[PDB]
């Protein structure tokens, strides 16, 4: 996360830290979002290089990546579902969404606490406008040109950018379609970054913090005319419901 501030997971209690097992402690790989006690949504691109549930561990309730966190919950991936139409195209990802059914070694799903909460899926449509300032959070880089990653959780505020704006040639042109969600800072000073992918785009809709997008791609981080691009979750509601319901 570029800009914003460091924060504890109580401000992002749905945030899921997704790691890969090593042959040797696991390596942090992607963010994710708890959308029901047993299910985590994230980006399919996080799993392509090794698409086996066995090789991943999910932690809820973490403010500091790769160390123990009070109130942590460690989960195995019982089921790994990647979108059937996932695709890469040399610039960007498409259909970039994954589901992870999580379970501890003792069989449990997430137990709600101050640090572990589900986040609401978006409504089918809603009448009544909401604000287009949405939160982003994760463990990604603090600048596109940083080597090294911050280790503690950050969060920030970006604003949704219309598809029509995001498809301008100065922006991403024809690479943006109706399934994507762009978000940027009007002054280009805060953005998601490398290592934030899979994490949530939280908008406030009908009073609910709401998972509106999943970090998918973006040219650099906080670059002018280059929004962060997000999987438009609302588009996949019936995909999601038909797998987790």
């Amino acid at each position: 996360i570029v800009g914003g501030e460091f924060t504890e997971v109580e401000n992002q209690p749905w945030f899921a830290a997704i790691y890969q097992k090593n042959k040797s402690p696991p390596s942090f790989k992607c963010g994710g979002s708890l959308i029901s006690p047993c299910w985590v949504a994230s980006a399919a691109h996080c799993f392509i290089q090794l698409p086996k549930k066995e090789n991943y561990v999910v932690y809820l309730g973490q403010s500091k990546e790769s160390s123990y966190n009070p109130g942590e919950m460690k989960f195995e991936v019982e089921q790994l579902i990647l979108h059937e139409y996932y695709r890469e195209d040399s610039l960007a990802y498409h259909n970039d969404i994954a589901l992870l059914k999580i379970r501890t070694s003792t069989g449990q799903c997430a137990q709600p606490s101050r640090s572990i909460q589900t986040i609401a899926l978006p409504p089918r449509f809603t009448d009544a406008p909401f604000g287009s300032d949405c939160e982003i959070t994760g463990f990604g880089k603090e600048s596109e040109s940083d080597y090294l990653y911050p280790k503690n959780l950050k969060m920030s505020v970006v604003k949704l950018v219309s598809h029509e704006q995001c498809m301008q040639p100065h922006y991403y042109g024809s690479e943006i379609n109706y399934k994507m969600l762009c978000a940027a800072d009007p002054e280009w000073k805060t953005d998601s970054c490398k290592g934030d992918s899979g994490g949530p785009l939280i908008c406030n809709i009908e009073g609910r913090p709401t998972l509106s997008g999943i970090v998918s791609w973006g040219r650099g981080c906080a670059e002018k005319n280059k929004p962060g691009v997000y999987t438009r979750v609302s588009h996949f509601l019936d995909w999601i419901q038909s797998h987790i319901g």
Binding site: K29, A43, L91, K194, G195, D196, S197, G218
Partner: peptide
């Protein structure tokens, strides 16, 4: 890896 990935492994 597509050119605009934000993935830790890209």
């Amino acid at each position: 890896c597509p050119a605009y990935s934000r993935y830790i492994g890209c």
